[PDB]
From Swiss-Prot, chain A:
Protein's job: One of the primary rRNA binding proteins, this protein initially binds near the 5'-end of the 23S rRNA. It is important during the early stages of 50S assembly. It makes multiple contacts with different domains of the 23S rRNA in the assembled 50S subunit and ribosome. Forms part of the polypeptide exit tunnel.
Key word Nucleotidyltransferase present: no
BP-aspect Gene Ontology terms: translation
Family in the record: Belongs to the universal ribosomal protein uL4 family.
Highest taxon above the source species: Bacteria
Molecular function as annotated in GO: rRNA binding; structural constituent of ribosome
Subunit and interaction comment: Part of the 50S ribosomal subunit.
GO cellular component: ribonucleoprotein complex; ribosome
Organism placement in taxonomy: Bacteria, Pseudomonadati, Pseudomonadota, Gammaproteobacteria, Moraxellales
Stated name of the protein: Large ribosomal subunit protein uL4
Region annotation Disordered: where it falls in the sequence: 1-15
Keywords per UniProt: Ribonucleoprotein, Ribosomal protein, RNA-binding, rRNA-binding
Gene: rplD
Length: 150, 117
RNA sequence: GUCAAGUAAUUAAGUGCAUGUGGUGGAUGCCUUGGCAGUCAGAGGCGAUGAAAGACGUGAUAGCCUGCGAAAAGCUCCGGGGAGGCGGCAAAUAUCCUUUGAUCCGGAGAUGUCUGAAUGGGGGAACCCACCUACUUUAAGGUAGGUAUUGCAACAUGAAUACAUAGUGUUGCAAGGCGAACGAGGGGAAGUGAAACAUCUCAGUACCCUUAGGAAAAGAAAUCAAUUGAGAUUCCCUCAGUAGCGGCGAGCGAACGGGGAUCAGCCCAUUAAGUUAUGUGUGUUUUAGUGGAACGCUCUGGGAAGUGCGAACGUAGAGGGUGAUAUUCCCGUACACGAAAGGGCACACAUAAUGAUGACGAGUAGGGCGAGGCACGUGAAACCUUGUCUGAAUAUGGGGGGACCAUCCUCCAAGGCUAAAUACUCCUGACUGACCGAUAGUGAACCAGUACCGUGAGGGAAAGGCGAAAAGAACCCCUGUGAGGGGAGUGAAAUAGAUCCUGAAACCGCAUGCAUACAAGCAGUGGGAGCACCUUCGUGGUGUGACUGCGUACCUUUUGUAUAAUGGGUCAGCGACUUAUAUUCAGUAGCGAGGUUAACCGUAUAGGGGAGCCGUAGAGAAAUCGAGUCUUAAUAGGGCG
RNA sequence: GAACCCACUGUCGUUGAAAAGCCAGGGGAUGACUUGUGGAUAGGGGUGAAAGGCUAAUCAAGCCUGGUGAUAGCUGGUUCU
RNA sequence: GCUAAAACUAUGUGCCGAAGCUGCGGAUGUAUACUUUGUAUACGUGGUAGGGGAGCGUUCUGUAAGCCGAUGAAGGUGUGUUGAGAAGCAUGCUGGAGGUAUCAGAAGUGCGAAUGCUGACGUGAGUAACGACAAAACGGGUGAAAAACCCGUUCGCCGAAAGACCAAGGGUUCCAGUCCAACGUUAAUCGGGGCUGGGUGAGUCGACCCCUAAGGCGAGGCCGAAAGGCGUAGUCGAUGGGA
RNA sequence: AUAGCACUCUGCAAACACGAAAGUGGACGUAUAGGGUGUGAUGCCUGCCCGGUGCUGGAAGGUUAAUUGAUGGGGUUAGCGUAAGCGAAGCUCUUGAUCGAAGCCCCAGUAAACGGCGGCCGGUCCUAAGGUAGCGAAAUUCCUUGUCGGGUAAGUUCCGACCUGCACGAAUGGCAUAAUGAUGGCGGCGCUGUCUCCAGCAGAGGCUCAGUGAAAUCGAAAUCGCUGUGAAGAUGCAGUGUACCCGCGGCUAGACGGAAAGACCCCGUGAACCUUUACUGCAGCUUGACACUGAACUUUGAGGUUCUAACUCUGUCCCGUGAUCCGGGACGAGGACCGUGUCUGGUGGGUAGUUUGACUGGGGCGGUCUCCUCCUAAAGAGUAA
RNA sequence: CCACAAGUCGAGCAGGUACGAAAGUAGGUCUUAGUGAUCCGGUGGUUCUGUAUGGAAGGGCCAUCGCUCAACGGAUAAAAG
RNA sequence: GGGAAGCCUACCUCAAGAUAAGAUUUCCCUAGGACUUUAUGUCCUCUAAAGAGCCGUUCGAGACUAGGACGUUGAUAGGUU
């Protein structure tokens, strides 16, 4: 805090409580007692623990019937209405779409849809797998995730 | 996450001041004095919940003594006579009867002195 | 009816409690043209062609702020844009400008007083006094240019002193000052710890001085290693709190080897890579901008974006605003276009110049004396620097491998240049936050480094909020043509009426109900009559409390406190066990005789990266052995396993 | 013995008219005198007919800013059930 | 207050008397059996320094483009009600736009004290005091209001300063009109107060200028790790000389 | 402080002081001058001691530094040896003979240098020497209000004198002294409200009314006396006595009243400043060795004589130049000295950083601090002052 | 016996001894006081180590020496008011 | 029975807040309605006594108060003689 170098008044004789600086944390306008600094909040996760958690999440989704397997999922043109109809026929209005590769047309079509996101097979994360109501997965993506074992 | 204390602190102080209603001067206006006053009131209540039983037993014994001496007995002799006669009516009911029904108390005293004889 | 005894009711000068209604005061809640910390990408300077920082002027009205400079809220040209505009506090008003294209936005020019390195001399900064040229005036002046010092170069001139040199002058060129952090170099403490203190530590830290660049420094082995192997410099992870140093105290603390980031070498007189300027060419980026989809009805309401019912766009459901909560009302967003003129960066050519007084390194290596640096404090002390005194050989030669000698291995000093990986943020653009929300966050959200204090260096505040829109209360009344209020009127709301959202507490009034003027103390607590109001009429509710038993505050510190031991006038707001790293133990989860990665790469919480760490075997000072080992002559005994 | 320069006694004043004074008396008053303007000496230093006196109401080592959040085996305080 | 006691000695029969014991209702810790149980039985439940266990509230992040809200959120102020507690819930009035379940996550997470910090307001108390004991009185005027302003008639005080000038220092305080909220230790129509407008005229007065003292700076120069010290020629510097 | 007095240093580029140096003051002075130290007009004067510390002068005897490096002993390898082992030279580790100054030890002088001027019963011991003049119950005398005289009715003060001076004394001056002093003590005249013993009066406050309007303090108060109890001196506890509610003018006995985290005392392994023959450094001063540093003749490694060319001059003249700086040149006087750098011995409260124990019927002074035996010690062990 | 660091008693086993004919006795003295940790150095020995290698210097291990550190569990090599 | 400057009376002053609030003399007030909480009941109209005070002139009484005298039917104060 700016200033505060000098003793405000002498140690004895004035009748006041003794003080050393006008920027003491007791005083209004003084420094904070334990001042914070920038922090790093990342934790370490064991590789095996992460992979096991992903496996458990996928198995729970399967046995809860929130994972929908589809042979092929492609879009003809970058059209939000076309994508919306394609998801509505599958009954997956709120969904995360996982594909072996991310087609630019599909990405552009999905960008503006609320509660719809599209990811590559190698970019799935545990929070995304849980947040969405359904996960629509292609067979090729399922095979790659199989090879990676979650 | 900076936390302000105003709402909770105000609620606590207001509850203490509400419990301090009716006291004299600063005891019902000033938080420090009011807070000291409420604790002392609680301590007094705890002690007096024990003192009350003794005070009421003393009152009953005095009234029974008056009735017995009206009927020609002392309190101790009347109690001993009732114990010997096996009557187990307690002092609260005995004092109530002494206050409100002279004839029944006279009958009880007759029973006690008959057992003493 | 008189008299006499006994015993009720009736007063409030003032006060207490409760409730109602106010005042003062400015907490709380909600909010934000202000802060804090970062990521990505730039940039890393300005100045004698006069800087940073200031003084004074400049307006129809002109005090302050902003802009500008006697051409003075502006002038000229080029480009954009298409209906308002004459900067803000700050309304009104006037004169006005503008589709013959204003205001406004971007680029390039013109002008640019005085002080300040200030540079014609001087000086108490914003002032005083000059000289010389050219033109101009006829009076006592005006215009423009010039007139500092130091260093270098050329020229001229020139003493003691004969040649000369010193000195002196003219011309041309260059430098000085300022500013955040980072770099390099010259000097360099003490508080503190060691539970005292002097060696030591703190620490080459704080501070002072000089001086660069966008980075700097270092750098191509007279280097390490010890299987005869590696191969310039810099930075990160390990090795490792190990080997060592140390009043062997407190403490200080490596290297070798391994894993990464980045990778690059070139010359000493005919002389290289590289770097810096100038011009040209090509490519990219940047300094204004243009277009840019799609909503209706009904209910509540002051107001609809809110309820209910249906519809449309989406490469656009980011954000902001509009009278309450909007993808379809406005500005915008995704996307697609766009530059007269100027700037940056990249690559390639031409010319300069530099590299580049230097051609294999002598007062040098080594030595005696005193110091300093190396993790290393004189130690068994190698190696580096040198204040003083000395002093080689020179490839059949010389340096090193931690005292010293021999053998081996390795390198060639006494001459130079060199990018990247690394360090930082005065500043610019965009974006972000389990950061703050007016006692917080910068000292400063507001005309703040201001008011104020000090001779001076210096120190250093407080102060945000009417309403959607001023629609900011015409007119009447009391009053001093005042202040203040009462009506009327505006507004959804005026107890939103100007220091105006909400309006808590301390503190101070008025009103009603009950108690209170014969009675002694932490002011309550357990009982308890009477009264007033309400009432489901009650074994009910609210207020009060005659009379009565018991009863000497709180905190701290102490053997022990009502203590006449400490602290507190009261209220509201703020105020004290945290953060990073290492280690040990306990829970819990994964894997399990195995477990786990670090730096780093990676459009990146994934996936790679096995160097390293812990566990799996002890004994011994150690060499050495090993389910054993040490001691011993001992296979005895015994200690650790 | 006036001006001027001092400060020996007493009363008052002591939240003063005043952070050193007023009143009544007192000393020197041509000298080692008093005084204006402008200069010099700077902190382990200055100056001192010497009291550790004075050096901006501060002196057995001035003031300001930094080291600095010095250290304190001492005192105080430490917030819901 | 007490004397064949209400004193002392000895004996006896009753009674009073504690938060001790018993009775009735409720809560909780540990252990043993029911071979989950939340159930019975048994033994426990005063506590400073300390150790252990379990919870309540506050701010922010996800869940949350969800749920509540102008038919009224947060905040403020009453009332009723629930739990063993920190606390929870419902609703009248005020207020006028936000709030946030559940389960996880992170903390600027709880104040009565530190002669603690900032602001506001009390008690003393309508108390002390209103700053030289040179001194005032009356008539008229103006004005809402006159002991204090203006005019007039009397009285008193200074007169080597309580009068008249200059330097330093200050900076509009000078003059006129107008106003009285704040300032003036009272009121004020008055003012050194607010507002508006005026006012400073030099060859001879002073400054500037010429000249120098103490002293300062100082081309070259001497000296010093750097910064710098001293100093020659010069150049400044009045408190002095020059119409 | 002072005029006067004394001691001492200083030969001029003075001693001394400031400054890192250049340089500046001393001083534009020259021993009748300048610095330091003590005493303090004047009159009479100023005794004894040189053992100690200091200062001055000698000595070349003993001790001692850097420098120098004679001897002795190890390490290593050519080679000689069956082996053990031996082992030159060369490098290297160590040992340290000889030379070597000042200082110190030693010998004298010095007190207007710092200092000293006794003991124990006439005597004796011991000293370096044992107080001269003058003065003395004093600015010095504990005992002490010593004793005597004067003053007073009565005098712990005053004056005179005496002298068993606890513990005067001659330039840290002795004894006096005219004049002088807002100087200390004592006694008189006049005078008085200083007092016996206070009274009256005048002005300014106090008090009342109108206007403005503070302060320190403060846990909360429905805030009596007495005797007792009690963290040991009670408004608040126990017993008892007294007392209707509330102001105003006075008063200061209590509220251990207000004010300032006691300054006395102790403690902290706190602070600061001052002193010294406390410890350890440094500045300053001083000695020798090496360098700057040369030549020619002599004597018994050292000493001497001479020279000039290094170097010095706060000496003269000339030039830059209009100049008491500075530089160059010419002279003159010195001269291998002086002086400076590195190394080294000595001195060094000038200056700096620090240390200087604890127990303890408070602290200090005294005593104690580790080990063995007995008692206290209560019939096992252990048990404090 | 004991906070630690320390202290005390000890049968018996192996080797080499002395005295006794022998069974045997002897690891100082009737016992309990006669003492000083660590660090740093000195001397003797050693089938330990030895910074490229062979040596060496230095270090280790075993035995032993230098304390009125007496404020005697011993703050420094070195300290009064 | 006697018996002291000592005790209670006696002398002077205060004294019924002596809540136990005492005593004596003298003086004053003798009207109508409405209603319900049917009671020393509350509201209207009429009435206002004996006295006390405010105010004024003042005091040998006085800080302010209190106390004493007087207010035209009058000597209370000033003036006048």
């Amino acid at each position: 805090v700016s200033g505060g170098g000098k003793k405000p008044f002498r140690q004895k004789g004035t009748g006041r409580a003794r003080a050393g600086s006008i920027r003491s944390p007791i005083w209004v306008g003084g420094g904070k007692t334990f001042a914070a600094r920038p922090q790093d909040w990342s934790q370490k996760v064991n590789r095996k623990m992460y992979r096991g958690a992903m496996q458990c999440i996928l198995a729970e989704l399967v046995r809860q019937d929130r994972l929908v397997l589809v042979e092929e999922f492609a879009v003809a043109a970058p059209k939000t209405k076309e994508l919306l109809a394609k998801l509505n026929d599958l009954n997956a209005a709120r969904a995360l779409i996982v594909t072996d590769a991310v087609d630019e047309n599909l990405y552009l079509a999905a960008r503006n849809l609320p509660h719809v996101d599209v990811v590559d097979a190698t970019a799935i994360d545990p929070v995304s797998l849980i947040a969405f109501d359904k996960v629509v997965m292609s067979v090729a993506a399922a095979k790659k995730i199989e090879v990676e074992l979650g | 996450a900076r936390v302000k204390r105003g709402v909770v602190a105000h609620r606590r102080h207001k509850k203490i001041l509400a419990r301090a209603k009716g006291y004299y001067g600063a005891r019902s206006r000033v938080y420090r004095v009011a807070f000291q006053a409420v604790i002392k009131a609680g301590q007094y209540a705890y002690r007096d919940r024990r003192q009350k039983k003794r005070q009421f037993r003393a009152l009953w014994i005095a009234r029974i003594n008056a009735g017995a001496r009206q009927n020609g007995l002392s309190y101790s002799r009347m109690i001993d006579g009732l114990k010997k006669a096996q009557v187990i009516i307690d002092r609260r009911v005995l004092a109530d009867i002494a206050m409100h029904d002279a004839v029944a108390f006279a009958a009880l005293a007759e029973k006690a002195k008959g057992a003493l004889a």
